[PDB]
Amino acid sequence: VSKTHSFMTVSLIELWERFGYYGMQALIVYFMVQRLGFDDSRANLVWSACAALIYVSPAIGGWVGDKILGTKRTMLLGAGILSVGYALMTVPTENTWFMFSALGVIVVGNGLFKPNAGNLVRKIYESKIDSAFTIYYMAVNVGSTFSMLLTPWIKDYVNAQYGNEFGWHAAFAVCCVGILVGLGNYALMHKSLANYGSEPDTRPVNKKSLAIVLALAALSVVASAIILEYEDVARVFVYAAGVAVLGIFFHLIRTSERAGLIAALILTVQTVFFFIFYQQMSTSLALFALRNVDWDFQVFGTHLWTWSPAQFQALNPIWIMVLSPVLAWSYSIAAKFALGFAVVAIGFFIYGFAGQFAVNGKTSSWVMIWGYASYSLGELLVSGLGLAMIMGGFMMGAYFVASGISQYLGGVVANFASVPQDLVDPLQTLPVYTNLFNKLGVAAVVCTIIALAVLPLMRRLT
Amino acid sequence: VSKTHSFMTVSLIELWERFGYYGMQALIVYFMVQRLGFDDSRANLVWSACAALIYVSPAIGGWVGDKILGTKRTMLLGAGILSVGYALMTVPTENTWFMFSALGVIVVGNGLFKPNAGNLVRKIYESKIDSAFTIYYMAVNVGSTFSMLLTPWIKDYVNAQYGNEFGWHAAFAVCCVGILVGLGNYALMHKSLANYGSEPDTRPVNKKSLAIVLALAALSVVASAIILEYEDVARVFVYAAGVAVLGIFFHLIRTSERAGLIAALILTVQTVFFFIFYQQMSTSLALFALRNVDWDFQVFGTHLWTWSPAQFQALNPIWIMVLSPVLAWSYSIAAKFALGFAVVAIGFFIYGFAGQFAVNGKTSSWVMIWGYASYSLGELLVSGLGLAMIMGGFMMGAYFVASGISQYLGGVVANFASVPQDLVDPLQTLPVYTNLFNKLGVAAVVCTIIALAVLPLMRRLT
Amino acid sequence: VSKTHSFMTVSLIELWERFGYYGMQALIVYFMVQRLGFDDSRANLVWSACAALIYVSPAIGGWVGDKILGTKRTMLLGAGILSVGYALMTVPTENTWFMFSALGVIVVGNGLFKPNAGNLVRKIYESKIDSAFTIYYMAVNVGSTFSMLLTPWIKDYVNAQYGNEFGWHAAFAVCCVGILVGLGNYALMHKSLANYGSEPDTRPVNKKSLAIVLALAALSVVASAIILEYEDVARVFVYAAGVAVLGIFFHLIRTSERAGLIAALILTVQTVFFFIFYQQMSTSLALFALRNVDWDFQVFGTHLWTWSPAQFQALNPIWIMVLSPVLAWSYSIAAKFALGFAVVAIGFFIYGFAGQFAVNGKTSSWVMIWGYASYSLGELLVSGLGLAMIMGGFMMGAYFVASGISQYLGGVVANFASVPQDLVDPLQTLPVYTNLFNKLGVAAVVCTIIALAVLPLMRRLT
Amino acid sequence: VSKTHSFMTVSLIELWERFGYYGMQALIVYFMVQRLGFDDSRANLVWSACAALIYVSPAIGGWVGDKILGTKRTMLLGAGILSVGYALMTVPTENTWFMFSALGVIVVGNGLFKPNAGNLVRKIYESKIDSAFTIYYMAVNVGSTFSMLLTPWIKDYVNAQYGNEFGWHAAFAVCCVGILVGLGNYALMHKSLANYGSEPDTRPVNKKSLAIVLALAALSVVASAIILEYEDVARVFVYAAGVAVLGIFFHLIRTSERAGLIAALILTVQTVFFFIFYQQMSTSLALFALRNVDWDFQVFGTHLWTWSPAQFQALNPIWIMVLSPVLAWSYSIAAKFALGFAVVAIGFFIYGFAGQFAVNGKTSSWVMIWGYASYSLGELLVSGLGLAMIMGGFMMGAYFVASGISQYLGGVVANFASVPQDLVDPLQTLPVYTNLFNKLGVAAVVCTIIALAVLPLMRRLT
């Protein structure tokens, strides 16, 4: 019908997938701490290790879709696997080895879906791909906004009326049917994308490669599950991946009139610094909002609604949609890496500033409003950190793993604010959060000083 | 003599008509609540239903003036009817069916005057019509400024010296003689406009069409009066008009390479949101200033004057004249719909912020100064909402009725802050106003988020 | 030698003349109130009547210098007369008729000096006259800065060491020798200006015209003296001048395609409004600083110096020199008349804001610092009000007298804050100043609204 | 190899030299007051007299390197002498005549190193010398940042673990090995600079000139040492140098169409004003941070680290690196001399503002953060004051000595806040610092008024 209509199909299946995922991520940390018996120091590492596997997962699935299998049907393979994942979350048990299987299925499902969905978005428009993606991302933000608001409300509602289990699991069931809605939506308008495939979707399926990847995918689920439960398995894995990145960089030092890549090393170091700050938003800030934030939302002394601690994470997509047009009007260069560090700093200082003026053991919820406004602003102007990163094949891969490991590294930083489960009084848990965030803000000021001091080197490469 | 001299005549008769009208609107809500025995929940609906009939009234009179009758003599017909309306208000009785006849006469009189007066202003300058109207509007603002200051003072003065009735009715008598002054002013300088008429004013009067419209006008007065008193008659009327707009839109969906009109639907939705916020200024804010605002105006601890609650509405034309040149210097695009929502939000938050810092049961009057500064600023940059709205005949009409119905809808929103007449203590009526305004400000923040999130769709139509 | 050297001579004699004058004006109001037995309501009218005669005095002397006598030797005649004036102030008596003779001599001396000094400055550069005057004015500001700091210190010093009289009179003696220094400075470098005269200085002196003006000058001194003491003589004089301006305007109405002069009438009305606000700075603000300002100047809790109430007026030339380059950098149109009204408003609100936060009966002296910063800023961007004012001969004269009368009118406005000399407690005199200034600030806000509302008329003349 | 590689060598030896020096300057005032028995009024004059000899020292060494000796080997001669200086500081005695020998060796060593190091930086790039120096200065700021943080920590650490002496002396030993590191770093990459020398380094060494300068250098060390201990010897020296500058200026008055140099005199006067304010940062601010600043650094109520009073001076290089790119983005003229005065003023007012809100006898350390942000900002936009200063040979020299003397003059201004060593209570020493800084801020406001009032003269030379 039109290229917009093919863009309509992929944006609809993309909207409903990020719906299911972010509706699950907002509750996955609370689910381990509250519903399951996980202490927070373990729930931080288990999620962060999963967030590391999730981030590097599109590297394989992006290659499987266009070199081996089909970018459409590999994207659909990822979607079907993701259906299983959230369906695996909705069965009501207290089995640990049951939830880790779902998270590993989510990791394998994510790698096969996300890059391929965004890959053919680039193929649909052959250079207004920038106009399409900017509408493609606003569809992501508007979709994840609903789920992060909807799914924690279902969790609160069904638990109040139906007992103890169905609340958390209907929330996950909502994420599962979200995937099925987008799959059904794609099944009806698939005709436009059927004529717009990758290079091998034109050609029929290779069952040798199909059986190989399906066996490796099941192998990967089990390999990802083991990594999550046994924390030390992930440590050595993170260590092994960390030494590899340090090796690819030194091997690149012994090469070439090519001083400009020592700046790429500096851009990688600050990237490791950045993901530790953003990973903090899903770990400590969720626990901070869980224990020491007054969910009662009152504007100038009148009650509106009582928050759910997972719905605070919906303020990230909201603030992205509110600030992206404002930055566009600001039109009428890796130094902006330093500017993002400064924004992240005052965001950690907001939570610190929250401790002084508002004291009841619980700081107000308005902190989560002004806080997430800062982190999302910081995220807005810097994210896509290594997309513009510039014989470069192992260089891009080193950037990937360094960003994946820092996801896990952000989890061990959040453990600095891991409350012992023998500390229940919120008056006593307030210092452990404000102390972490305050020096985290100081550390972000140091990164600002670092990136600003290193600026004469960046201007010298140009 | 000159085109400016023909513009001088129409601007003088326009200045004196908006003088009579706004001098009556500032007191019409108080007149029903104070002088008459109307509870506020009824005075809100009766005025809002009248403000709905007033807004859509120029649709007929604008067509009667240039297609059937004469834009000059239809404008003059409206003016003469408006003379009767304010004269019908000045007779001192406690009869309900007596005031509703005046309001209906005002509705019929308004439709015949306002569009035709502004119609020939466009005809006088054949493209500096933008230069004329900008002077034509400043004449409106300076005229309605006097009456909204003058007429409530007469109401206070004559009531203090002459008892109980003459105060309110001399205020309306002032609005009536205001119309007669402009009619007398037009009767002397009519020679310039006599040579500048519509298409049929050239031709003599058609008494068949004259008698038909005069009978329909009297029919319309009675039809408008019945709608006001019996609130349910207006509800079904508003319902019937609401279903019609929903029908014209769907009938337009089944038509056409014409996706751009789904944005016109979005522009209509936010317009319904907008008029509910501005209708709030005449309903709840007048009652808020009536019961819970300290009329004592003191600047840094010295008494100046004591306000009349109706004179606060004169701050809207004043702030329009103060801010329109400032915005002009700001020169050295339906996203400004979102910007207006943000301004309206902080305006409702001013009244909310008023509740905390200033507490005696009565908030200060400076709230009405900074408040109306915000609403008028918001109004300044967005109003004329659907003038630039773009086979389009039923589309423009759907925009009209959707904006008229929202006038009545703003009245039912004001009823959320309808004080029971058994609640006299201002300390107890302060929460009912601050609670409405505060969440109204939150609702305007949501509209800001909506219009900003929908911005990639508006940029895609261009 | 050079045109700069001829500009050096006139700027040096100009610097020393404004030295003597402003060194006398800063103390003339205090001298009548403190040293003499004048109640403030009389000292306000007597000075304001003199400030009116001073302002319109250059009209005659500017014409005497180039049409009748010699712009150089008329300027020198004014200077010699001004020598007598400050010498007439230095003789220690308590005779009223003795000081009024000096003030009248100052009025006659001022009219003969000021325009002629600035006249040949225009002649020296034949179009960089704008570059010369901008240096010519900075010489005025730096000269009047010294005297307004120096002369009140001499008054305080000599009174403490020598008794009661010599303090005030040595201060005036300092102003007299200031004139003599500039006369001596001119007597040495007169060779450059001797070749740069007016049209008749080339020609020899006409003793018929010389004797006529010298007799009229003595006649004018006595006529000016009588006007000052007997207040009613000035009232009828001000009335007679007021009716004349109202007559010249109506006589101009009966003339001419010349609607643009009704804006000149509006520019005159706001000018009358402006001079009332600036005349307030010399009248009420001097009395406010005299009675209710803590002369103790301490910055963050450490004593620097103790002010003299007359030295606060030196903050006007200081702030002029500080803000004129800032406005120049602001480069990278009678609406600025409205902007000046807004600045004057917040200046009167500073003194009002001073009343609340600082209360001991005496407000801090920092008010005089931030206050004079506002008035001088306001003065900076609007002053020279009718220099750009555009068969125009009686029109310019009407602008002159309307600005002169408003000087006296500003004196009667200051009388609204005239303290009875039976009210000594500063706690009781604080309201009478804060009440005047606060509503004066409200009146300046009205002028802002007026000039902004009238802005569509000004844009229509262009 | 490349011009960058020759720039790499000089920037590495420069980084390590400013490392040793600023690591010594941060502790030299405290060393005299704390470790030695010097009262602060003497430690201020002794350092300021040394800072005067240090500033004018590059005048000889800059001429010795290119006219007599070799810019490379004269720079290396200075470096070797500077090695001796910090080695002379590391031997643990209480002998006064022992430390003064080191400071004099530092003065002779500094003059021979600093200009020659920066001289050939200009020679390496023959016009991107501005691009090299901007990277050359960032290497200076990053190097002095480490030492000013590192050396006071060694002083605190070794004193706590090893007693009383080794702390201060290992800190100086760290500065000595810093010089040796850069000398060793230069000894390895000397091949690139060996081909890039001055005019006579090409030619072999002249042992007549070598022996003469080495004897004069030893003579200069003893001459500099005597000047430091005996304060009156420096006074007459400063007097003799002061009369010389007043003589060179008058001798230049009797010369020449050359009025523009009376502005150079004005630029010199404000320069004397400037160096007194910046010299204050090393004298009084170090003592203020020593006695009346809470070294406990807590952000929003959580302890980070406890400061060392010498490490506050590391905030100057840090803020330079943070603000220099911000000023570069401000791109999208000796009036900026006035702007720097205004910045310095609010910096002295920060310390004054510190006295009111924070009172325990000790003001917070955040004052040192916001304070040094102002002084460094002021320094950023004005420093290099007389580099652009424009038969001019004695004119440049007069500018040098006037800037050197003001270093000593800043020391006598700091003595206005010299606490008697019989005043130990910090509650009693707080006024003596806040009183100095507050009126120092007032004096900087006067310099702002002066430079702004003199601005019409500067615009007239262009």
Numbering used by the authors:
A (entry chain A), B (entry chain A), C (entry chain A), D (entry chain A): 8 to 133, 137 to 266, 270 to 345, 356 to 413, 421 to 492
Copy text verbatim from the article accompanying this structure deposition.
In this study, a combination of X-ray crystallographic and single-particle cryo-EM analyses revealed the species-specific tetramer formation mechanism of PepTSo2, in which the two asparagine residues in H12 and the unpreserved ECL play key roles.
To further improve the resolution, we tried to crystallize tetrameric PepTSo2 using the LCP method at protein concentrations of 20, 45 and 75 mg ml−1. Microcrystals of PepTSo2 were obtained using a 45 mg ml−1 sample under multiple conditions containing PEG 200 as a precipitant. Since the size of the crystals was too small and data collection from a single crystal was impossible, small wedge data were collected from microcrystals using the microfocus beam at BL32XU at SPring-8, Hyogo, Japan and were combined using the multi-crystal merging software KAMO. We finally determined structures of PepTSo2 from two different crystal forms at 3.5 and 3.9 Å resolution by merging small wedge data sets from multiple microcrystals. PepTSo2 forms a tetramer in both of the crystal forms, and the structures superimpose well (with an r.m.s.d. of 0.83 Å for all Cα atoms). The structural comparison shows that the present tetrameric structure superimposes well with the previously reported dimeric structure at the protomer level (r.m.s.d. of 1.1 Å for all Cα atoms). A slight movement of H12 was also observed, as in the previous structure, suggesting the importance of H12 for tetramer formation. Furthermore, the tetrameric assembly appears to be stabilized by hydrogen bonds between the asparagine residues in H12 and the unconserved extracellular loop (ECL), which was not well resolved in the previously determined low-resolution tetrameric structures.
